Design a binder for these strands. Structure first.
Lengths: 145, 59, 125, 72, 107, 72, 202, 97
RNA sequence: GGACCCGCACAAGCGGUGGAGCAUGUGGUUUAAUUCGAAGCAACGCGAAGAACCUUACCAAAUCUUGACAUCCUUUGACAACUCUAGAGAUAGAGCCUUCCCCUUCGGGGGACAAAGUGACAGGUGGUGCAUGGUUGUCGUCAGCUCGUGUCGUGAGAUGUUGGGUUAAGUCCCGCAACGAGCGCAACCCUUAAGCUUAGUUGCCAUCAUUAAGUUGGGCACUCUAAGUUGACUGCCGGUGACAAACCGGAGGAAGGUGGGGAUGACGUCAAAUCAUCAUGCCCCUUAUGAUUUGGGCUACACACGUGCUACAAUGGACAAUACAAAGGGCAGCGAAACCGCGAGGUCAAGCAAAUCCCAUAAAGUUGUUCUCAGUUCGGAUUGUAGUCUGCAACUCGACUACAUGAAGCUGGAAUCGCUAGUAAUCGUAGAUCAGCAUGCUACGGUGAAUACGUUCCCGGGUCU
């Protein structure tokens, strides 16, 4: 319940990228996640020519919802806090990077960041599906919890 | 069963059927061969304090 | 000329020495290329040279065993922070505001005799 | 490569020695004829070739379904 | 034997429950006496502050008596409708009650 | 390992003339040596003695897969 | 399920009943000590030994019995300890030395009163009278608390009850508190009655 | 030097021998180094708590065995004669090297 | 039925089970019995922390009757071991004396043995845990359960224990016919988290020579090792607080609110488990329901359920180089180095009864080369051949290695489990049992998360009404 945070990674100095490192690790291996994020960020730098934090911040705002349902006994479109917004955008970014069907994760997360910068793919389809579920139940309830 | 306790304290035909028992009871399984006692006699003689050994669970 | 701090985290103890120089971390007198696996994340151990940026000019020469590599590198951070405490006592608030000086008592927890893998209760049907 | 294009083909496998390779030991289905000849010579643990147990034991108690069916 | 609102907090007893309230006034005579043979810092700190709270509550909510050796032969109350539990024991102890009549209650 | 056949002298007596009836052994740990091909043993399977005939091909196998006791 | 405080307090405030190092042999030592205690339990039936502490020094054995009736192990001039020492020298093939120590407050050590409630309950007495006279005669000799629980077919019944008569402080969860404990079986004609005496001597 | 390996089970009986034999070699000799502690490593015995069922609750019994090294350099005839002469631990393993 | 609060009890997640193979356990079925127990949570990798023979009761055959064992009486007596014949061995039959150790005059007494009488007696892992002791799960580490004295009520019972507030807590404070006390909560106990004192060897190398090497010369600086100690208690400050408990935040500190964890499991419930650790009332068998030994058997299979390992791959497979540890074991044991082995392992053998020597390279990781989405370069199930180890011995029925075979399997239906931080996940290591044999159990480290707005709902428990 305090939810303490982690230090920024020194290559791209932001606090969001180390949380993305903590999301793409699997079974504890941090260095494999550091190998498949940094060469993926160099692949987005060699594909679309701009800074990697600039194209990452314009793609992480397209995955980030403003509404979410909360199922009860029904679905209430409650406004979500920005920490839940950024972990749900990171969770949809990793989990809809992982079902893409390509070869290596520096070609699989990198193309999903390049599709999420231009509003394409399965992460922004999950944000649009959460927005259709939040406008389909907007006239149902906006008061329960 | 005191047939098997008197049976296992004898020279056998092979050298590797000489097996291990508790030396006060006749329990065949879980005999600690540092002590040559079973699971319940080691607990009972450690709770009476008649073996050198402490209960401590701070491994 | 020699600031002997020590520092430990998570079964890994670092005996650092601070001699003045340009700056070169030699863990077991080798490098920081072959010893520490993460080339990028050796900035955990270069945190009291960047939080306390009065000077980033300190040769740390360090010979200790224990642990793995990451908690060993946080012990390099704890040894460099305790050696920067004993090098100058006015750095104490500057270390103490940014964490970096607690021996954090998270060690590897001790395995419970009912549970299978140290609070990994073995699957009720 | 040349090492991975010979493995699942019968005879030669994974740890073999190295257009000259057209000769040698029992690369063909004569090793399969040798294996069926050893199964025919054992048919006694040939009474356990209907079931799932070799000439060095298996303990079929819960799982011998490689030499059985799915449900049956 | 009685006050106004023996300073405050008339407890459930102290006349006809004497034999276990004798242990309380002998405990006040105990814990005044055992300060002098070694009280502070031969015990932990987390017993002596509630010992001082026990000495404070045994002279505050008890009131002002210490040498009550037996049952007194009368009561002297001022308020007999707040001290209804004080005026109910003396009819069972065969001792008279002397009190200032307040509204409707009588000693 | 090294093939034992600890009761070899039970067979080497009856080697001169024809093999008189059957021979009751109580040892399934004894291997078959290749000098009693043709002999008829009685292997104890736990319940009773089952007769076996050593033909030509079982000269590495012990007397234990012959006379089974697992039935069905 | 409460564990016993003669087992919880070894290595804490209560010393062991086996003070000898052994590294190599050890199971040929300890069982010898167990056979030594299976000779002393034989004399317990009359002379009421509480506990035996074996001090195996290097080759000789400083066996120290703690009995509450010391005149029935020591004889009239030293004869009964000498025949006890000769029978133990026969039955362990080492040198032994019977060091008897003389304890007072015989109704305050838990082996003596647990064995005493066992000798009362073998003689078809009532369990409530011997429990209440045990806790009052153990309180008037001076203690801080005695629990006494006897289980089994109480009074020759059919359903097994377990009744306890506690008075005073018996704080079993405080680790620095010297609590004596003993249990003793009583072989009655209606089975076995197991007593359990828990004395907190302050 | 001569090395003794003074070794016990509980620490209460090893400390009195460690202040006994060091002052015994100090009053009748010269230059004794003190009671050097060894790692004192233990054997942990984990048995089940119950009798028949119930492996889910178990009991742990460890056997701690403390060792103290005492080293005596440049010994006299007073050291070796009073070293094996003085004996009151009642429970430790005295080895003489 | 309500109010209120709390636990991984739901939500927020993360990783599994259920789908496949295999290991283990149970039920069903079967055989000569697949030994007997455990049966919703609280049975189902459990008694069993060691089923080839032994364990082993169960089962077939050959066998013995004061017996395999324990005590006492009589005769003899320092016991016997080792060879040979038969037998599957137990055992019978010879060779053969080991043949008074304490001791008296020759005859004795007698630690201690063998035979007979088969006498008393044994023996039973046979039955009932619904006769029992002892020991243990369970609600549940949940905060409850009560008593003395006094009061009220004709009583049974209530007060104390309730009402307000707070907490993990019947924790503490205030008010009060209650005042206290007991068991339980809390530490006192151990471990971990920082420094001092003490003491430096086998441990560590600052300063210097020095070598393959902290391995010796030197030193105990530091780490280390461990018996002492100081330290963490809401103790200081500020606010909210009835000016009281308590909460929230900050300083200081290595540690902040029982710091993290273990031990510790109240009164009792379930006629819960154990007559198979042991002891035991009663009943039963006592040329069998006792006993020895050989060979099976617990290690079966058309199936079902529970636990667990391995996978379904590219965050990966294979190959080459390279680093870092904690905890533990070792005397018939731990097996260095070196040689020969593709390899399991063997020949020879240094050192160590342990901070010395060995197990012991930890592996994941890092850096390269290669493979390029397939039932494959994934997996290694099944089966054949040849072997190694241990053991009088691998057939039922051990582990492992080599070569070949490469079967289902491409992230799993309803449902379901674990977990709030060094935790989940994943990777190896060590012990016990052990002649050999674990994917189980216990224990240790390496890397190491995301989350928890809330507590409305599903279960389980507690307080009052």
């Amino acid at each position: 319940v305090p939810k303490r945070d982690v230090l920024p990674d020194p290559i791209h100095n932001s606090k969001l990228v180390t949380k993305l490192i903590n999301k793409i690790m699997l079974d504890g291996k941090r260095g494999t996640a550091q190998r498949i994020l940094y060469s993926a960020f160099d692949l987005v730098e060699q594909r679309s020519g701009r800074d990697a934090l600039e194209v990452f911040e314009e793609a992480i705002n397209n995955i980030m919802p403003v509404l979410e349902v909360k199922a009860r006994r029904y679905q209430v479109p409650v406004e979500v806090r920005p920490e839940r917004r950024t972990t749900l955008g990171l969770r949809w970014l990793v989990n809809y990077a992982r079902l893409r069907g390509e070869k290596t994760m520096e070609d699989r997360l990198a193309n999903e960041i390049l599709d999420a910068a231009n509003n394409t793919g399965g992460a922004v389809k999950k944000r649009e599906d959460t927005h259709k579920m939040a406008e389909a139940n907007k006239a149902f309830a906006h008061y329960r919890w | 069963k005191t047939s098997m306790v008197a049976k296992q304290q004898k020279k056998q035909k092979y050298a590797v059927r000489e097996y291990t028992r508790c030396e006060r009871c006749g329990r065949p399984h879980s005999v600690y061969r540092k002590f040559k006692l079973c699971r319940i006699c080691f607990r009972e003689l450690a709770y009476k304090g008649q073996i050198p050994g402490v209960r401590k669970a701070s491994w | 000329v020699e600031y002997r701090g020590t520092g430990r985290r998570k079964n890994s103890v670092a005996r650092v020495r601070l001699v003045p120089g340009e700056g070169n971390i030699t863990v077991n007198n080798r490098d920081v290329r072959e010893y520490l696996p993460f080339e990028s994340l050796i900035l955990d151990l270069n945190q009291p040279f960047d939080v306390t940026e009065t000077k980033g000019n300190y040769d740390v020469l360090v010979n200790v065993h224990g642990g793995g590599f990451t908690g060993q590198a946080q012990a390099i951070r704890h040894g460099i922070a305790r050696a920067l405490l004993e090098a100058d006592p006015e750095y104490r608030g500057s270390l103490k505001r940014a964490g970096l000086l607690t021996r954090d008592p998270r060690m590897k927890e001790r395995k419970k005799p009912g549970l299978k893998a140290a609070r990994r209760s073995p699957q009720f049907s | 490569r040349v090492v991975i294009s010979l493995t699942y083909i019968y005879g030669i496998g994974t740890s073999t020695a190295q257009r000259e390779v057209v000769d040698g030991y029992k690369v063909e289905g004569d090793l399969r004829r040798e294996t069926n000849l050893n199964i025919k010579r054992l048919m006694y643990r040939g009474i356990r070739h209907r079931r799932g147990l070799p000439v060095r034991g298996q303990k079929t108690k819960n799982n011998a379904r490689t030499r059985k069916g799915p449900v049956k | 034997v009685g006050t106004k609102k023996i300073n405050q907090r008339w407890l459930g007893g102290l006349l006809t429950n004497y034999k276990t309230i004798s242990k309380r006034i002998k405990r006040i005579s105990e814990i005044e006496k055992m300060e002098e043979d070694g009280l502070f810092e031969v015990l932990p700190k987390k017993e002596v502050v509630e010992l001082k709270k026990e000495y404070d509550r045994l002279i505050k909510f008890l009131g002002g008596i210490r040498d009550m050796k037996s049952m007194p032969q009368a009561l002297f109350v001022v308020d007999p409708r707040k001290e209804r539990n004080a005026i109910a024991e003396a009819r069972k102890l065969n001792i008279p009650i002397v009190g200032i009549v307040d509204t409707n209650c009588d000693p | 390992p090294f093939v034992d056949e600890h009761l070899m002298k039970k067979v080497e007596a009856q080697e001169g003339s024809e093999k008189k009836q059957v021979i009751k052994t109580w040892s399934r740990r004894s291997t078959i040596f290749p000098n009693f091909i043709g002999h008829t043993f009685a292997v104890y399977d736990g319940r009773k003695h089952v007769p076996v005939y050593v033909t030509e091909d079982m000269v590495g196998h012990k007397l234990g897969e012959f006379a089974p006791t697992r039935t069905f | 399920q409460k564990i016993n405080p003669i087992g919880l307090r070894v290595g804490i405030i209560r010393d062991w009943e086996a003070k000898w190092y052994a590294e190599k042999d050890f199971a040929s030592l300890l069982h010898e000590d167990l056979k030594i205690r299976k000779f002393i339990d034989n004399e317990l039936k009359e002379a009421s030994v509480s506990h035996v502490e074996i001090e195996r020094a290097a080759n000789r054995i400083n066996i120290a019995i703690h009995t509450g009736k010391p005149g029935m192990v020591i004889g009239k001039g030293g004869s009964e300890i000498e025949k006890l020492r000769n029978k133990l020298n026969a039955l362990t093939d080492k040198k032994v030395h019977i060091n008897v120590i003389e304890i007072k407050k015989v109704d305050l050590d838990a082996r003596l009163v647990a064995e005493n409630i066992a000798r009362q309950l073998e003689n078809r007495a009532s369990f409530r009278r011997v429990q209440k006279q045990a806790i009052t005669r153990a309180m008037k000799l001076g203690a801080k608390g005695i629990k006494t629980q006897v289980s089994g077919r109480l009074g020759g019944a059919d359903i097994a009850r377990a009744e306890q008569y506690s008075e005073g402080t018996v704080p079993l969860h405080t680790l620095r508190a010297d609590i004596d404990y003993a249990h003793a079986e009583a072989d009655t004609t209606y089975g076995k009655l197991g007593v359990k005496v828990w004395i907190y001597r302050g | 030097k001569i090395r003794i390996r003074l070794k016990a089970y509980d620490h209460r009986v090893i400390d009195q021998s460690a202040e006994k034999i060091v002052e015994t070699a100090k009053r009748s000799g010269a230059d004794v180094s003190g009671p050097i502690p060894l790692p004192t490593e233990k054997s942990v015995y984990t048995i089940i708590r119950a009798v028949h069922m119930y492996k889910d609750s178990r009991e742990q019994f460890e056997q701690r065995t403390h060792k103290r090294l005492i080293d005596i350099v440049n010994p006299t005839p007073k050291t070796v004669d009073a070293l094996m002469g003085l004996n009151l631990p009642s429970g430790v393993d005295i080895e003489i090297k």
